[PDB]
Amino acid sequence: VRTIKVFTTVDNINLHTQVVDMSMTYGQQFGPTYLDGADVTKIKPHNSHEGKTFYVLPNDDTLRVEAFEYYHTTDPSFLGRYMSALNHTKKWKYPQVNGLTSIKWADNNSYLATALLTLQQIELKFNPPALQDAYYRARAGEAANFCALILAYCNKTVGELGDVRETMSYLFQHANLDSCKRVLNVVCKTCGQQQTTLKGVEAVMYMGTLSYEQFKKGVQIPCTCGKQATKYLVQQESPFVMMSAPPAQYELKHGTFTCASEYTGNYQCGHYKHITSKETLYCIDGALLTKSSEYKGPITDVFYKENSYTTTIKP
Ligand SMILES: COc1cc([C@@H](C)N2CCC(C(=O)NCc3cccc(F)c3)CC2)c2ccccc2c1
Ligand SMILES: [Mg+2]
């Protein structure tokens, strides 16, 4: 009987020494086993595997504790989905486009590239240590693990089309939006006591209008009756705000926003591009980059910097 020494882990932090019989497969001795994103459950240990680290499913209780401490989820399939996604995202390209890490287009990753480009331009802190380690490694240029994790946290798969706003919501759930708070006032003769206060994801997100200044001044509620119900922002305390609206022809003025998302197409087939404001306006589409002084396009998401805003409108 011949043998090799390997390591097994669920977080790449706590490694476990393992004696492996080379006459069996990794699936027989460990369960579902992954080697750098690759599935090696059906493969027998090779001599080259000596001293290398393998991912396995949380089969015992200590591994479950380690996996939860790293990923902040109880989903047992999470590691499997993450490894399956990494098996593809390791083959993607991540070029530095205008100081940001983008993704060369493949397998309908347009929304993924836009989300990755957005996250690099907003002050945001993640709670899962896995997310934070992959975030740093993505800003450094190795975003494969980051993309696979984002796919795993959103219950999306490689090749499936995605929405940037949905992805941003899923990731904001795993973010430290604690101090973030939003206070709004509903103006209508019916409503004579509307001082709504929101904390959490809904403190930094809104779906209705793209303009943040038009949100501060006032916008009409989608009332089916048309009661001229008015909504304006009373107070905002957050490092950023994300204004979303159905894809509409919008004029992006330089210096008035941080970044924005353009969506060209219909509902079941479209393409995401990312617009950023630097010294001029830049459009990143996968690995491609364009510049201009002005921009008008089908916008759907706009991000703005914020710290503390207080309204001027007295009730
Ligand atoms: C009225 O609200 C919208 C919103 C969108 C944008 C924001 N958005 C784009 C991605 C899209 C999506 O998830 N596509 C994948 C998909 C969805 C359903 C069936 C499939 F097979 C595949 C979700 C929505 C709009 C984008 C384009 C046109 C109208 C939109 C209206
Ligand atoms: Mg591929």
CB 156 within 8 A of CB 168: no
Task: Find out whether 10 and 66 touch, Cβ atoms under 8 Å.
Answer: yes
**Which ligand has the nearest atom to the CA of 246?**
1
Are the C-beta atoms of residues 54 and 11 closer than 8 Å to each other? Answer: no
Q: 73 near 155, Cβ under 8 Å?
A: no
Instruction: Report d(CA 272, CA 292) in Å as an integer.
Output: 18
Structure tokens belonging to residue 204: 């930094």
Are 136 and 194 contained in the same domain?
no
Tokens of 222: 């989608």
- Quote the ligand 2 centre to 89 CA distance (angstroms): 7
Cα(92) to centroid of ligand 2, in Å? Answer: 7
Q: Which amino acid is at 262?
A: E
Is 97 found in the same domain as 74?
yes
Nearest CA to ligand 1 atom 31: 246
Please, which residues have CB less than 5 A from ligand 2, an ion?
88, 91
Q: Which residues contact 35 (CB under 8 A, 6 or more apart)?
A: 49, 52, 54, 55
Q: Helices 110-119 & 164-173, crossing angle to 10 degrees?
A: 50
Q: How close is the Cα of 88 to the center of ligand 2, in Å?
A: 5
Nearest residue by C-alpha to atom 22 in ligand 1: 268
Residue 272 dihedral angles phi and psi, to the nearest 5°: -90, 135
* Same-domain check for residues 69 and 172: yes
User: Which ligand neighbours the alpha carbon of 148 most closely?
Assistant: 2
CA 180 – CA 175 distance, rounded (Å): 11
Please tell me the distance from the alpha carbon of residue 138 to that of residue 100, in angstroms, as a whole number: 10
Q: Identify the nearest ligand to the CA of 210 by its number.
A: 1
d(CA 181, CA 289): 35
Half-sphere exposure at residue 256, Cβ-oriented, CA atoms within 13 angstroms: 13
Range of the domain at 117: 57-180
Strand ranges (E), the chain:
3-9, 16-21, 33-35, 38-39, 53-56, 96-97, 100-101, 181-187, 196-199, 205-207, 219-220, 230-237, 240-252, 259-265, 270-277, 281-285, 288-292, 295-305, 309-310
Are 16 and 115 found together in one domain?
no
At residue 108, φ and ψ (nearest 5 deg) are 60, 40
Among 124, 158, 180, the domain boundary falls at: 180
Token pair recorded at residue 197: 């206060």
- 129 phi and psi angles, rounded to 5 deg: -60, -30
Residues 193 and 256 placed together within one structural domain of the fold: yes
Which residues line ligand 1 at a C-beta cut-off of 6 Å? 161-163, 165, 246-247, 263, 266-268, 270, 300
Half-sphere exposure of 315 (CA within 13 A, CB side): 14
Please tell me what DSSP assigns to residue 52. -
Burial of 96 (0-12, 13-18, 19+ CB in 10 A): exposed
Q: Which of 267, 268, 273 to mutate to test the pocket of ligand 1 (most atoms within 8 A of CB)?
A: 267
Ligand 1 centroid distance, CA of 153 (Å)? 20
Q: Which long-range contacts (CB under 8 A, 24 or more apart) does 73-82 make?
A: 73/128, 73/153, 78/152, 79/10, 79/55, 80/32, 81/151, 81/152, 81/155, 81/157, 82/148, 82/149, 82/151, 82/152
Tokens 């493949």 -> residue: 106
Helix (H) or strand (E) holding 29: helix 26-30
Query: What number of other Cβ atoms are within 10 A of residue 71's Cβ?
Result: 22
Please indicate, yes or no, whether residues 38 and 92 belong to a single structural domain of this protein.
Answer: no
Rounded Cα distance between 21 and 286, Å, is: 45
Whether residues 162 and 190 fall in one domain? no
Residues 173 and 291 in one domain: no
Q: Which of 160, 180, 200 corresponds to the end of one domain?
A: 180
Tell me how many domains the chain contains.
3
Q: Whose CA is nearest to atom 16 of ligand 1?
A: 268
Residues 156, 110: one domain?
A: yes
Atom of ligand 1 nearest to the CA of 265: 27
Q: Are residues 52 and 78 in the same domain?
A: no
Contacts of 15 (CB under 8 A, 6+ apart): 7, 8, 9, 53
- 83 with 123, same domain: the answer is yes
Token code pair at residue 34: 């992954």
Resolution of this entry, Å: 3.2
Q: How far is the CA of 85 from the centre of ligand 2 (A)?
A: 9
Residue-wise burial string across 105-119, b where 16 or more C-beta atoms lie within 10 A, e elsewhere? bbbbbbbbbbbbbbb
Which of 121, 154, 180 terminates a domain? The answer is 180
Method: X-ray
Beta bridge partners of 230: 187, 220
Residues 271 and 231 in one domain: yes
Amino acid letter for position 13: I
Q: Token digits for 60?
A: 């015992």
Name residues whose C-beta falls within 8 Å of residue 58's C-beta, 6 or more positions apart in sequence: 10, 64, 66, 67, 76, 79
Q: Which atom of ligand 1 is nearest to the CA of 162?
A: 13
Q: How many CB atoms lie within 10 A of CB 76?
A: 12
Residue from 112, 154, 163 to probe ligand 1 pocket by mutation (most atoms less than 8 Å from CB): 163
Helix (H, G, I), strand (E, B) or coil at 275: strand
